[PDB]
């Protein structure tokens, strides 16, 4: 029973592998890029099954020209005892062999086998460093990604910094797009994993992210640069970038990525004085994970110092587990700024003594200093009057008849005309 | 069948400040208990209140005797004969709701009703189980069954006769309430039905009209609610029967805020003891406050806090705090000034609000179109 | 049925008087209009507030200085009422395209 | 023209919904495109002429 169903699943997975190989072969036909991402898109689906039988069948099936590069995976490859070339000795395309080696890499990655995984990944990316074909650039992106992933659970992410830097440059000269973006994101993750935020920031300023990058890669890059600018006091742009990242993240999957981005967005918005909307704290897939961040947010809204301290004491482990402890401390000292933002949002004119009384600041001069500091930033638009005690807010002129809507709607033109231009450029009529 | 909420919400689930834990309501529940003897309300009564008193089993003895006798009668009438469709089997399950629902539980009754539904053809049985278990899941906090049954009735069952489901919006009084559903829909079907009630099983007419008024004046603040809830005939008649509700409604409509707040406090308190208590009494009294504040702020450009306090009940400082809290929440467009003691309204004109809405909706559409464009053509 | 009708007639007459007065004025003390209409300041203020709220007379009431202001709302808005709706309309269109995207 | 374009957009949405449940087998789109083109040409010309007038005549 189980053996029969397992065999059918293995056969259908092998058929999908055959189809992917044929698609990669067709990609070089016509001398055009793409048609490889079609095979690479179902990569998680194929990766899910990856039985030993199907992997061995594929290895024996597409490698009629036996060389040593396969004679390394064979020692770890286990064949069925009692239990197909799709068919001459035509030499293998580099993309095809890279693909099959990549699924080997993924299987050995899944089964917690890491050291020989490091070896096979090393032998995989050693060869592709010699090629100069754009068809092998799309596959190279995933190759590097799972190479870094292999080195991650091997706890040697620091070693690969040189290799990723070299491949990133190589992609930069060859005007690579997918490989360049994947390498840049891997480099950013490497820098962050060892808290080298200054190095990551310096790298970001000197490297331009390709606009034609994939949605997932764009989201990852946005999250990484948002974390950079958030731990680098550029809170407003960090929040903007994090929201942009959440927009481009996959909707169905990517639970962990969305959880991390939501946690950081909560902390950044709280630091900015704004209040995150309660809606995100309610989705199932996000609720419990954000539960520690929820009890925190309430305190920020109330300014209850004791509640903040208790939440920190009972959830510091979780906060450090996702690396939000330091930002949370900065928030613990910016709760007052949040309160001042709320006060100035509600009131138009208000005496400083009222500020001190409402915020429990225990001093009118201290409230004066705090509101002056907050209004120095873009936190509050006001105009303090020390002669009397006002915190008079700026007059709200009619935004219409003010050239501001013209500017916004001009940006929206630029965007929509740009979208139309790319859409009409990417029509790609066929030859026959 | 089982009308008075079985007194169980007001029974010992309203302790502390509401304090309702023992009174004549316990007597009413116990008389509704002893007649058609039941042990199902005695689950929690076997745990916390009247846990192991003499009566707890002194009633259980002949209760079990009676329910065994009647279940035996039903089983004999079910096995001896082979009655089809709406039959003695449906009688067994309707009793089983008059029973084990009020002996131990709905689960057996839910199963039996499912079986007879597979056996029956006509539709009132399905509505019967809908309301049976809506009230049971108001006893035991069930909503998925209610919405499943409502979908079954409305989408599929309501292709023969009609005129029945409307009042089963009572769940919609408490489904999406604290944002959109304590009102809007819950009022547009209460209003659509107030003329033709014909559902006295769930609630008397007076209670239905009070619910209708309560949900309509939060659904509709002054968007010509008068065309349906003030010029309304039957609502006006029952309001002639109910002075408190009529005063509470017309005080808001006639801008008599000083008495409108006292009526709202009375509504809050009498609402804190209901099937409607636990869901949104806090929410309703916040929304009505915001509604009255926006009504007063409208038709004004700058109001002295003293004028508000004297004309809106009391509490210059109370009104200051409330306006601060409500502006901080983004509602109640107005800016409050300190010791100058002015409140300035900043409601944008039609053009500016139109521009802001254009920006918002266009940003939504542009993000959608950007995502769509980028996932296509890679 | 004669007290109710006469009270309604009195309110109608008060509204008609109040709109047939203040028409000259663009920003007038409520005290002056109370004097002109021979009614209490609080009574006429309440009636004015109710009339504004019912949108039976365009204007605003600045209680901070005890004044009543009169103006009109521009009807140029109509194009946005189309514009906005069209946006939501094509929102649906984009949604449909998403389904076709699921085809590809 | 914007009202006509709204009606055309409703028709376009209705027609596109049919596109899904229809294999390869007046267009509310072509009319939509024509209205869009006339709107953009008219308003672009009017804007540019207006501001050229603002800045060439003092």
């Amino acid at each position: 029973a189980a053996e029969h169903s397992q065999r059918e699943l293995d056969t259908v997975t092998l058929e999908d592998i055959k189809e992917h190989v044929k698609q990669l072969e067709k990609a070089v036909s016509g001398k055009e890029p793409r048609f490889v991402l079609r095979a690479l898109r179902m990569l998680p689906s194929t990766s899910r099954r990856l039985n030993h039988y199907v992997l061995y069948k594929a290895v024996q099936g597409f490698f009629t020209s036996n060389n040593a590069t396969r004679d390394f995976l064979l020692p770890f490859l286990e064949e069925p005892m009692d239990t197909f070339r799709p068919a001459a000795s035509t030499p293998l395309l580099p993309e095809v062999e890279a693909y099959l080696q990549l699924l080997v890499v993924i299987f050995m990655m899944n089964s917690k086998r890491y050291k020989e995984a490091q070896k096979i990944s090393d032998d995989l990316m050693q060869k592709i460093s010699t090629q100069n074909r754009r068809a092998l650039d799309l596959v190279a992106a995933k190759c590097y990604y799972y190479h870094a992933r292999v080195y991650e659970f091997l706890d040697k992410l620091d070693v690969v910094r040189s290799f990723l830097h070299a491949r990133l440059r190589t992609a930069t000269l060859r005007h690579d797009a997918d490989g360049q973006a994947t390498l840049l994101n891997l480099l950013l993750r490497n820098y962050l994993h060892y808290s080298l935020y200054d190095q990551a920031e310096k790298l970001v300023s000197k490297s331009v992210f390709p606009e034609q990058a994939n949605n997932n890669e764009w989201a990852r890059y946005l999250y990484y640069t948002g974390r950079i600018k958030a731990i680098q006091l550029e809170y407003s742009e960090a929040r903007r970038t994090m929201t942009n990242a959440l927009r481009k993240a996959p909707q169905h999957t990517a639970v962990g990525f969305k959880q991390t981005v939501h946690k950081l967005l909560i902390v950044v918005e709280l630091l900015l004085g704004e209040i995150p909307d309660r809606l995100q704290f309610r989705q199932p897939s996000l609720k419990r994970s954000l539960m520690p961040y929820f009890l925190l947010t309430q305190a920020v809204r109330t300014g209850n110092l004791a509640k903040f301290n208790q939440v920190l004491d009972q959830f510091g482990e979780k906060f450090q587990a996702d690396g939000t402890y330091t930002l949370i401390i900065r928030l613990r000292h910016n709760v007052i700024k949040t309160g001042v933002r709320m006060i100035s949002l509600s009131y138009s004119r208000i005496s400083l003594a009222d500020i001190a009384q409402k915020l429990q600041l225990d001093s009118p001069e201290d409230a004066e200093f705090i509101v002056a500091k907050a209004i120095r930033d873009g936190v509050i638009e006001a105009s303090i009057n020390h002669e009397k005690g006002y915190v008079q807010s700026k007059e709200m002129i009619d935004i219409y008849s003010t050239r501001e809507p013209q500017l916004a709607f001009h940006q929206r033109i630029s965007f929509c005309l740009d979208i139309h231009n790319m859409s009409v450029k990417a029509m790609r009529f066929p030859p026959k | 069948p089982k009308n008075p909420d079985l007194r169980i919400a007001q029974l010992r689930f309203l302790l502390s400040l509401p304090e309702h834990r023992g009174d004549a309501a316990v007597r009413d529940e116990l008389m509704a208990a002893v007649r058609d003897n039941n042990m199902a309300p005695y689950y929690e009564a076997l745990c916390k209140s009247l846990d192991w008193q003499i009566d707890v089993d002194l009633l259980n003895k002949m209760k079990k005797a009676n329910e065994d006798e009647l279940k035996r009668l039903d089983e004999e009438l079910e096995d001896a004969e082979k009655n089809l469709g709406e039959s003695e089997i449906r009688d067994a399950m309707m009793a089983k709701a008059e029973y084990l629902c009020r002996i131990g539980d709905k689960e057996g009754a839910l199963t039996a009703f499912r079986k007879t539904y597979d056996k029956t053809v006509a539709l009132g049985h399905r509505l019967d189980i809908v309301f049976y278990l809506l009230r049971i899941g108001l006893f035991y906090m069930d909503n998925d069954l209610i919405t499943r049954n409502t979908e079954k009735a409305k989408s599929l069952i309501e292709e023969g006769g009609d005129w029945d489901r409307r009042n089963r919006l009572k769940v919609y009084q408490g489904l999406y309430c604290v944002a959109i559903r304590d009102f809007k829909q819950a009022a547009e079907l209460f209003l659509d039905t107030v003329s033709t009630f014909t559902s006295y099983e769930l609630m008397d007419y007076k209670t239905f009209v009070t619910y209708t008024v309560y949900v309509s004046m939060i659904a509709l603040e002054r968007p010509d609610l008068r065309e349906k809830v003030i010029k309304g005939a039957e609502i006006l008649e029952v309001l002639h029967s109910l002075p408190a509700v009529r005063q509470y409604l017309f005080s808001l409509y006639e801008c008599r805020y000083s008495v409108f707040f006292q009526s709202l406090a009375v509504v809050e308190q009498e609402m804190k003891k209901d099937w409607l208590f636990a869901p949104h009494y806090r929410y309703y009294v916040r929304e009505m406050r915001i509604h009255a504040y926006s009504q007063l702020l409208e038709s004004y450009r700058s109001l002295t806090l003293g004028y508000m306090a004297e004309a809106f009940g009391v509490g210059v400082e109370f009104i200051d705090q409330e306006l601060s809290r409500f502006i901080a929440a983004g509602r109640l467009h107005c800016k409050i000034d300190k010791v100058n003691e002015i409140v300035e309204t900043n409601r944008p004109d039609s053009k500016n609000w139109q521009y802001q809405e254009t920006i918002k909706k266009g940003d939504l559409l542009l993000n959608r179109v950007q995502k769509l464009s980028r996932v296509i053509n890679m | 049925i004669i007290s109710t009708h006469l009270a309604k007639l009195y309110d109608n007459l008060l509204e008609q008087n109040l709109i047939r007065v203040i028409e000259p004025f663009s920003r007038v003390q409520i005290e002056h209009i109370s004097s002109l209409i021979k009614l209490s300041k609080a009574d006429v203020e309440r009636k004015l507030s109710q009339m504004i709220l019912d949108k039976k007379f365009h204007g605003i009431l600045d209680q901070g200085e005890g004044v009543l202001i009169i103006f009109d709302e521009p009807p140029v808005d109509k194009t946005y009422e189309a514009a906005l709706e069209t946006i939501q309309n094509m929102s649906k269109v984009v949604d449909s395209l998403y389904n076709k995207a699921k085809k590809l | 023209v914007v009202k006509e374009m709204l009606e055309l957009a409703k028709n376009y949405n209705k027609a596109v919904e049919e596109e899904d449940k229809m294999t390869p087998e007046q267009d509310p789109k072509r009319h939509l495109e024509e209205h869009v083109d006339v709107l953009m040409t008219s308003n672009i010309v009017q804007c540019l002429a207006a501001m050229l007038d603002t800045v060439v005549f003092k």
Binding site: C416, I419, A426, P430 | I376 | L97, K103, L104 | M40
Partner: peptide
């Protein structure tokens, strides 16, 4: 805005039809 959005959405829809029709022809090539 309005006109551009409409024009952009129409162009995007025209791209969907092409990106579908092309893969239809390619799959037929089967």
């Amino acid at each position: 805005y309005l006109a551009s959005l409409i024009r952009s959405v129409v162009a995007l829809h025209n791209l969907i039809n092409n990106k579908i029709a092309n893969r239809d022809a390619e799959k037929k090539e089967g």
